[PDB]
């Protein structure tokens, strides 16, 4: 394919590149704990009119 010919002569020819493919995906938590106080707003004893 690389030589684009059916016959190939004596010698050494660079043809392609081999690469290892990623096994799986990783995403990283920033350890964020800035949770919203909407819960106690939801868990409110009284609501406005």
């Amino acid at each position: 394919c690389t030589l684009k010919s059916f016959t190939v002569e004596k010698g050494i020819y660079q043809t392609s590149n081999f690469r290892v493919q990623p096994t799986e995906s990783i995403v990283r938590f920033p350890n964020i704990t800035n949770l919203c106080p909407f819960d106690e707003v939801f868990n409110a004893t009284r609501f406005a009119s």
Partner: protein
């Protein structure tokens, strides 16, 4: 990023999170979950080259993986990568699969590199051999020893030198804007 991830020995200042090397790619990143620094190197890559005696002389071939440790490349990883049973030789150029290294030295036929060459020889198989510089001759230097030729031979040798290349002209307009 995409690459194999390992621990990082190099220290990081508190403000800096990731580090880019002289290649300007991030070579070390600190884990957001656990502030420990980790070293990132890309997944192993390399180019492949095929050593072939020629289509006339059988279809047996040997392939060399440039600049890659023999243990680095698995036998599984499009091609079957032959097999571990196939002879594996580790060279400075890289890992070579499918050729027998021999201790006999022969004149180069296909240059693998770093003093290694391969050829199709018989039970014909591809064999990798160390370069043979030439025949070893020792000439006896002495205080009073001289050699004088008693005969001569007339030899004719051929030298071939390119002189001219095919003159070429280009009609620019029809190549760029044809018809």
């Amino acid at each position: 990023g995409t690459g194999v991830l390992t621990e990082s020995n190099k220290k990081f200042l508190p403000f800096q999170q990731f580090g880019r090397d002289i290649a300007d790619t991030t070579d070390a990143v600190r884990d957001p979950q656990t502030l420990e620094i980790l070293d990132i190197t890309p997944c192993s890559f390399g180019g492949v080259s095929v050593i072939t005696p020629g289509t006339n002389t059988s279809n047996q071939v040997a392939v060399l993986y440039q600049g890659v440790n023999c243990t680095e490349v698995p036998v599984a990883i499009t091609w079957r990568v032959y097999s571990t049973g196939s002879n594996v030789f580790q060279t400075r150029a890289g890992c070579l699969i499918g050729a027998e290294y021999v201790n006999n030295s022969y004149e180069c036929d296909i240059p693998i590199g770093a003093g290694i060459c391969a050829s199709y020889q018989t039970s014909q198989s591809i064999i990798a051999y160390t370069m043979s510089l030439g025949a070893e001759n020792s000439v006896a230097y002495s205080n009073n020893s001289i050699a004088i030729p008693t005969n001569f031979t007339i030899s004719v040798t051929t030298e071939i030198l390119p002189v001219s290349m095919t003159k070429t002209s280009v009609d620019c307009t029809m190549y760029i804007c044809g018809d």
